[PDB]
């Protein structure tokens, strides 16, 4: 398509609307109410340009450019005198009742209104009256609510209610009185609830933690990270003042999370300002504790490591590529054990074999939006892997979309696109043990134990081809869903099968891969996703290794009297008192890590592991791309005592202290061509970031924006003598504004965005190519590895039944987003977010135990009786018993395991 | 219904028609045609954007036509009378008859049915009866408030 | 503590009858429940959303919209006077001024006994015999400010 904007042609996409397709060519056009993922509804009247009719036309016509196609041979003017004024007046219009709140409001310096206002070139008042004003709504404990700062652009509700799917926020009353919010206070019920302060264009809802310790986005220093909370691999930007992290943005990536986290991954960051993390290397004497300096510590240990027999080491899914590898070069390959449980792992290699080996491409979160129509065997999406339950949900519009486009309705105009799609949508089928919160769309929810939904999945593939291994005992009415299930999965064009090892079945896995071959062998375009567990799960099961009952034997049979363990609570993976056991009767237990765990009371030698936020390293994430993460600040840079160092470069410090009885740190570019060298599976994460070296014209990549300030006075109480800036040799970015952030700079990683004029999270639309598409040169992260030639075979063993039996409650999970994450249970803020730990019980389960809701029950598990208070699940078929996993004292590894002796407390 | 024009098989003719009252809440932006719709539809009664038109997708996305009382009033008697009687009622680009009338402080304030065409002094002065004694009049608006 | 009545239920049930969609009856239950009670109070939100299946804060955009789905307790009886265009030519203001003295309170207020809930409405459509008024279910037109304590007299 052709368009002549303001003299000069222009090549668009014919598809686009004129404010995208403009925005998308560099040209500057205010906006409030569109935005790229929510479409355009024409709400504020901000976005007005002048079309032509023709090239000799001189008139013309006020038009949103958000609603107006870009269609070939359009003639619009962005600078025409009656388009400025009036934008100029719906900036004027809007700033009539606006508060006199930027002193005291969290948006100032990030503010889309502000740098609109700036942007029209409006600054005078000449409005005299009153202002109207609102009360405010308690919005729980992540999100702070100022309506008065409305500008009622409607893009709360519309991102809230359409796009995420929740049902409590809404807009109300009328004409200059609208009000945006819930009906009444309460916490916002939605997991993706968080994205509304980057939705919102003004200081309405804000990031209350943030709030708490809030700074201003010129006072921070960012990074371009991962977020660690699970293993979908959104991209973030932390940013940070005062040592301390203070803020989780959401980075764009056009592959993985574009524009959204969810509140996990956005709140669940606090873990890294507690104060009891270790901050130097921490050696007991008796029950005395001394503080050693890392050279110390690092002579001290391979003294005691060289003195011993044999030392094994335990990973763990949190810890980094490089920092998984740096140990099991330390203690040996045949010595490196996983630190999770035998079942688990077992779990996790099958779906890493399904992935590459089953020859059933698996895609990324932003192409799960395309498939139509959607099988969930098993993982609690919502509570596990959140994002991608996001995405099924578009995924899911996805056939309003369709029937939209046979209409010749622009796919941006979306109030029509809804209008046509009434409550017609792409086929759901989720499977769980209890009701999910994607069952709000989903066409069927079968609620079953986890034997009984493998049973339902190798169904499902026989029905689909007769080759695959046939279930018997099929009951009819359950036979009639699965027709149901069938029918909609043969004649979808693109079918997606997502499974995990959230759900603690193997069999779910087969079924699921069992699915996904019987489609592809009918020649459909299915794709197969599994949801891992933690951030680099998938990585610690490329990377392999015995799994962690193989070495509490070895420290239990006491053939290895030197255990390494590596960013691990192994309480998560094991019964409590085995650990315990295995690690007293140890004669050396170093752990290496960044949170103060239940095993460092056993520790001899405690080693501050630097976090995420403190760290550079590679994670893979369970669609299999690796995507480095890069420190957000120095530690060490307003306390000098700290000593928190890089686990890799911990444990490479300690090789090379043992071996040559010198300390040698490393540089990170090394330990990425050691993992590439010795493990070839790993060889992508080579190409996940550039190295070190790497320059934009020879500068360095910026991770403070331009206006830092406090520059010579933020250490002035400690010392008036400013420090030296520190120095990363580890990666291209540099700990300072002496840098390059510019969005035409030739790189993939961005640590945040601004441009002059957007300072705003609008600034993003600067640094992509088109707008809602990618990163300009792409975006970060590779894939490990293709999708294979060939695919697996049929597994063919179908599971029986689940019968229940008496004194043997199966237990079934139910994972949390907020509280299944051990390092966001750890946040401070997660406690009010924290649901009470309720023991689910059938109606008839607890009628026969004479028990109501509410009352408590005692359990014994690995010995030990604990108390939890009755919840009644009626979706919770009997013979089960429901507990949510990774809680305190409830570790994920419970998942799929009986329980004995279930009594009234 | 009753006497069978409304319902199933209308006439014996096989049409099948159900006519419902809806009656409203209080809001003057629902007499727009397309926030009509969105109110008829249980929902806060902001308009829609054209295109695409209530005769593409309209009331629950179905095709939709709206239309004012005063000109479904006007169909049956072209429909019984013909379209040539309609025509001939005035010689005027507008065809047909219209409800007419004033209102404010005149004698006789009230509602005429008139063929397009009439010019205001003749409903003020033949048919309002003009101003009131004592009144003079400054100025009027033509159809309603907007 | 708010529980919809069998009558109420069952009218919302038959209301849904007539759409295809049961959103569309949110609007007719809203008004169900406020001819029972004389207003909607908040568990009726609640109790509409659950019985069409739509979430309560559709349902209380939709009655915070609506200016006679009233979302606050009124009087016994709810005069509604035009202050529109043409009843503002033929005299509102001396039937607004009677109605204030007579009920000693301003609009948008109770009176203190609950019995007359005073509100300026949009257009009666009723304009050629101004100034009019609605009392609960019926129009009064002509209206003179002798006239309103008379008529006010009527509605116990
Ligand atoms: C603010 C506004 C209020 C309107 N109110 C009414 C109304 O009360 N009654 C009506 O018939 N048309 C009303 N209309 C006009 C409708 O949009 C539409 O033209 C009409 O309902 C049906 O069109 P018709 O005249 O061809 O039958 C209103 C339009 C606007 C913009
Ligand atoms: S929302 Fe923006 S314009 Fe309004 S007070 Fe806050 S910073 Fe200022
Ligand atoms: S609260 Fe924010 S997002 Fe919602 S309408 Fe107001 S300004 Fe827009
Ligand atoms: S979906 Fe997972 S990776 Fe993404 S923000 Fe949430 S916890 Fe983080
Ligand atoms: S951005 Fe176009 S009208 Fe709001
Ligand atoms: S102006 Fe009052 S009834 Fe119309
Ligand atoms: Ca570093």
Request: net charge negative; with cysteine; charged share 25%.
């Amino acid at each position: 398509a052709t368009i002549h904007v303001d003299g000069k042609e222009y090549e668009v996409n014919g598809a686009d609307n004129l404010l995208e397709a403009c925005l998308s060519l560099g040209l500057d056009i205010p906006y409030f109410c569109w935005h790229p993922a929510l479409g355009s509804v024409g709400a504020c009247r901000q976005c007005a340009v002048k079309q032509y009719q023709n090239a000799e036309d001189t008139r013309g016509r006020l038009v949103m450019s958000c609603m107006t196609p870009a269609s070939d041979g359009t003639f619009i003017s962005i600078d025409d005198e009656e388009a400025k004024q009036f934008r100029e007046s719906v900036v004027e219009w809007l700033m009539t009742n606006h508060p006199h709140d930027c002193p005291v409001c969290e948006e100032g310096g990030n503010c889309h209104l502000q740098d609109m206002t700036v942007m029209t070139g409006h600054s005078f008042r000449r409005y005299r009256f009153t202002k109207r004003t609102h009360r405010n709504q308690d919005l729980g404990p992540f999100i702070s609510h100022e309506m008065n700062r409305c500008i009622a652009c409607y893009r709360c509700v519309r991102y809230y209610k359409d796009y995420a799917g929740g049902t409590d926020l809404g807009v109300y009353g009328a004409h200059d009185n609208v009000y945006f919010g819930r009906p009444e206070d309460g916490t916002l019920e939605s997991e993706f609830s968080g994205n509304l302060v980057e939705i919102c264009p003004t200081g309405v809802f804000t990031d209350k933690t943030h709030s708490e310790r809030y700074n201003r986005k010129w006072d921070m220093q960012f990074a371009p990270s991962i977020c660690q909370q699970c293993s979908i691999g959104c991209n973030i930007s932390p940013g940070e003042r005062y040592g301390e992290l203070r803020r989780i943005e959401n980075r764009y990536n056009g592959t993985v999370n574009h524009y959204f986290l969810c509140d996990r991954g956005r709140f669940g960051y606090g873990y890294v300002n507690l104060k009891d993390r270790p901050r130097q290397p921490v050696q007991r004497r008796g029950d005395d504790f001394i503080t050693l300096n890392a050279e110390q510590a690092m002579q001290g240990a391979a003294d005691i490591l060289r003195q011993s027999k044999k030392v094994i080491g335990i990973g763990s899914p949190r810890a980094s590529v490089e920092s998984n590898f740096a140990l099991r070069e330390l203690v040996g390959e045949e010595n490196f054990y996983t630190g999770i449980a035998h079942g688990e792992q077992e779990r996790l290699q099958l779906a890493l074999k399904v992935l590459r080996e089953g020859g059933i491409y698996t895609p990324a979160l932003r192409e799960i939006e395309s498939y139509d129509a959607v099988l969930v065997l098993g993982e609690d999406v919502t509570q596990t892997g959140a994002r991608v339950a996001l995405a099924v949900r578009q995924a899911v519009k996805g056939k309003a979309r369709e029937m939209a486009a046979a209409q010749k309705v622009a796919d941006w105009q979306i109030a029509a696109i809804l209008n046509i799609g009434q409550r017609a949508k792409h086929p759901l089928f989720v499977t769980n043990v209890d009701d999910t919160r994607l069952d709000d769309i989903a066409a069927w929810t079968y609620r079953a134990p986890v034997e009984d939904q493998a049973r339902l999945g190798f169904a499902i593939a026989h029905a689909l081809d007769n080759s695959a291994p046939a279930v018997d005992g099929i009951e009819p009415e359950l036979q009639s869903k699965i027709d149901v299930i069938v029918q909609a999965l043969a004649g979808a064009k693109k079918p997606l099968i997502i499974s995990g090892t959230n759900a603690g079945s193997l069999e779910v896995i087969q079924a699921a891969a069992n699915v996904a071959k019987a489609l592809k062998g009918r020649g459909a375009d299915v794709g197969i996703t599994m949801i891992a567990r933690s951030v680099n799960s998938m990585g610690l099961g490329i990377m392999g290794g015995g799994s962690l009952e193989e070495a509490l034997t070895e420290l239990e049979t006491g053939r290895a009297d030197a255990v390494v363990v590596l960013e691990n609570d192994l309480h998560r993976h094991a019964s409590a008192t085995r650990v315990n056991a295995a690690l007293a009767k140890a004669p050396l237990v170093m752990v290496v890590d960044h949170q103060r765990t239940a095993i460092m009371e056993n520790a001899h030698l405690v080693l501050s592991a630097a976090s995420f936020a403190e760290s550079d390293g590679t994670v893979i994430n369970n669609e299999g791309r690796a995507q480095r993460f890069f420190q957000v600040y120095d530690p060490a840079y307003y306390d000098s005592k700290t000593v928190m160092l890089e686990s890799w470069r911990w444990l490479h410090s300690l090789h090379s202290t043992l071996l040559s009885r010198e300390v040698d740190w490393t540089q990170l570019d090394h330990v990425i061509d050691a993992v590439v060298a010795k493990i070839p599976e790993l060889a992508g994460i080579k190409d996940a970031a550039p190295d070190a070296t790497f320059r934009i014209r020879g500068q360095k990549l910026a991770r403070e924006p331009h206006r830092y300030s406090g520059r010579t006075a933020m250490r002035a109480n400690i010392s008036v003598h400013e420090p030296r800036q520190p120095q990363d040799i580890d990666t291209m970015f540099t700990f300072s504004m002496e840098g390059n952030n510019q969005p035409t700079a030739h790189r993939s990683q961005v640590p945040f965005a601004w441009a002059p004029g957007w300072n705003s999270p609008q600034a993003w639309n600067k640094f992509q190519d088109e707008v809602g598409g990618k990163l300009r040169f792409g975006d970060p992260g590779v894939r490990l590895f293709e999708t294979s030639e060939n695919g697996l075979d049929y597994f063919t063993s179908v599971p029986a039944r689940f019968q229940p039996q008496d004194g043997k409650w199966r237990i079934a999970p139910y994972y949390h987003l907020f509280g299944s994450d051990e390092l966001s249970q750890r946040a401070p803020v997660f406690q009010s977010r924290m649901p009470q730990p309720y023991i689910k019980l059938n109606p008839a389960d607890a009628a026969k135990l004479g028990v109501n809701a509410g009352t408590r029950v005692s359990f014994s598990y690995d010995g030990n009786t604990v108390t939890l208070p009755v919840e009644i699940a009626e979706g919770l078929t009997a013979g089960q018993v429901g507990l949510p996993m990774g809680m305190s004292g409830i570790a994920p590894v419970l998942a799929g395991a009986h329980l004995e002796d279930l009594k009234e407390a | 219904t009753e006497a069978g024009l409304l319902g199933k098989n209308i006439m014996g003719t096989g049409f099948d028609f159900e006519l419902f009252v809806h009656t409203g809440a209080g809001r003057y932006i629902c007499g727009e045609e397309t926030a009509l719709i969105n109110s008829l539809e249980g929902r806060r009664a902001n308009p829609r954007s054209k295109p695409p038109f209530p005769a593409t997708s309209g009331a629950w996305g179905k095709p939709t036509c709206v239309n004012n009382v005063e000109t479904l009033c006007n169909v049956p008697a072209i429909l019984a009378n013909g379209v040539e009687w309609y025509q001939n009622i005035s010689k005027s680009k507008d065809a047909g008859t219209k409800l007419m009338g004033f209102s404010g402080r005149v004698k006789n304030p009230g509602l005429w049915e008139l063929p397009f065409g009439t010019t205001a002094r003749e409903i003020l002065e033949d048919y309002a009866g003009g101003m009131r004694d004592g009144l003079k009049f400054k100025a009027w608006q033509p159809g309603g408030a907007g | 503590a708010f529980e919809l009545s069998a009558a109420e239920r069952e009218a919302i049930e038959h209301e849904m009858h007539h759409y295809e969609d049961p959103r569309a009856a949110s609007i007719e239950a809203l008004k169900i429940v406020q001819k029972q009670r004389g207003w909607v109070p908040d568990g009726a939100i609640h109790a509409i959303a659950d019985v069409l299946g739509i979430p309560a804060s559709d349902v209380e955009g939709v009655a915070t919209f609506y200016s006679q789905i009233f979302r606050q307790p009124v009087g016994r009886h709810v005069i509604r006077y035009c202050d529109s265009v043409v009843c503002h030519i033929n005299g509102y203001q001396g039937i607004q001024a009677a109605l204030e003295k007579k009920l000693n309170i301003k609009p948008g207020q109770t009176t203190f006994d609950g019995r007359f809930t005073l509100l300026p409405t949009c257009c009666l459509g009723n304009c050629d015999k101004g100034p009019n008024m609605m009392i609960d279910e019926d129009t009064h037109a002509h209206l003179t400010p002798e006239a309103i304590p008379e008529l006010l007299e009527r509605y116990k």
